[PDB]
Every structure is written in structure tokens, then in C-alpha cells.
């Protein structure tokens, strides 16, 4: 059970894998969005996610011309019908900050974050 | 370039076994025979629409618990993807980092090319 007690958040912030780190930090300075997903060719085709702090560090290291696709964290999926404590245990154990939530028809429902899971469990 | 493509380490989609998630455990266990630790892939409506996998032994536990009438998807496990252009070392790192034993390989558009195991990648570089 996931969607049945926590609703997956919508994917609202997508960036192209071919976009460069410089371009990203350029276009999205002071962005309110903390969960930037990376898409490959179609905006529908999520292959990873990035963290702005991490990207900035790479830029300061002269890696600003690198493409998001080459430096992103790979996208991971969690099933809708998985127990929250288990999802939590898995994400923590793997240091996974966010995951796409998928149902039993292969449909992407939205995304969850480890902090979102934390916040829900802790409220119990 | 550097090493061989994950696409040569994988089992190609056409020869990859998968079963309908709506099949009951009872019918699956009766229809399909395979070893205690096999991990059949599961598809939703289309045979290419691969949405995870199940452990045969967990299927068998279910049946013996009197839940054989339930669908395969009852105990479905997620399956992750790796990109066809990812260097074999990086792939190895990524699956290890996430403790993956199995993963679908996809192209830049998300189309499943095949199934790669960590065992086969491990084998290859060590």
C-alpha cells in the first residue's frame, strides 16, 4: 500500500538529459522545485533526477559543460502496492532520495521522496 | 571505445520469458514449470509491457497458504531499467549501489531491449 495512504506527487519539473549543467544552473536559479526529473527524448521518458547542490559543485569543478544525462542519479521505481516501512527501509538503505511510483498496469502515478516517506511514517 | 555494450551482456527481449500478471498463482504454478528460485518476468496487458517480476518460491508459499486463487501481481516485485548507452562499469556500479540482481535494458526512448543480470555483468569484468 502506497497511494492508499500517501498520494504520489505529480512530475512537474522535467529537464532534458542533453541540457548542460551550466544551462541548468542558468535557467533554474532560485527554483522552488526540489525534485528535478531528467527525461531522455520524450518528456514522458524519465531516466533520472538531479540535485542542484551536487550540480553546482560539479560546475565549480569545471564540469559545467557536462550533460545532465551523464551525471544524473538513475531513476528508480517503487510499486504502489508496497508497504511503506519496506519502501522506507529500501530507500534509506540505498540512499535513494526519490522514486517514481508505478501501479500494476505499469502506469507512472507520480513520485515519492525519502523525506516524504519519513514524514508520513513519523506521523504514526 | 572502452568496453562492450550492456546490450551484448543482456538476454534480448525476444528470448526473455514473461507471463500475464492477471494469471492466478494456481494456474501459473500448474501451467509453467521451472526451478525453485526462478524469477519469471511479469507483463500487464501487452507482452512488452513488462512491469516487474515475481519469485516462484513466494508464489508457492502463497499457494500453500491457501491464496493460490490470487493473481501473480499480488506479490509482484519492481524491476528497474538501465540505459543501453551506459558503460558496463557504470551499470555494474548502479545495480550494486541499488542492490539490484536483475534489470531491464532500454534505449534512449524507453523501449525495452532485454534483461541483464548482475551475475552476468560481474562474470564479465571479474
UniProtKB/TrEMBL annotation, chain A:
Domain of life: Bacteria
Localization (cell): Membrane
Domain CBS: 71-124
Name of the molecule in the record: Hemolysin
Taxonomic source organism: Vibrio parahaemolyticus serotype O3:K6 (strain RIMD 2210633)
Amino acid at each position: 500500500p502506497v497511494t492508499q495512504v500517501m498520494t504520489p506527487r505529480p512530475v512537474v519539473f522535467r529537464v532534458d538529459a542533453t541540457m548542460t549543467i551550466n544551462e541548468f544552473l542558468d535557467k533554474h536559479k532560485d527554483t522552488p522545485f526540489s525534485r528535478p526529473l531528467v527525461y531522455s527524448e520524450q518528456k514522458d521518458n524519465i531516466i533520472g533526477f538531479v540535485h542542484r547542490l551536487e550540480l553546482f559543485k560539479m560546475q565549480q569543478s569545471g564540469s559545467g559543460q557536462k550533460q545532465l544525462g551523464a551525471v544524473m542519479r538513475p531513476i528508480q521505481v517503487v510499486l504502489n502496492n508496497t508497504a511503506l516501512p519496506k519502501v522506507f527501509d529500501q530507500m534509506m538503505t540505498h540512499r535513494l532520495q526519490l522514486a517514481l511510483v508505478v501501479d500494476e498496469y505499469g502506469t507512472v502515478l507520480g513520485l515519492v521522496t525519502l523525506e516524504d516517506i519519513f514524514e508520513h511514517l513519523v506521523g504514526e
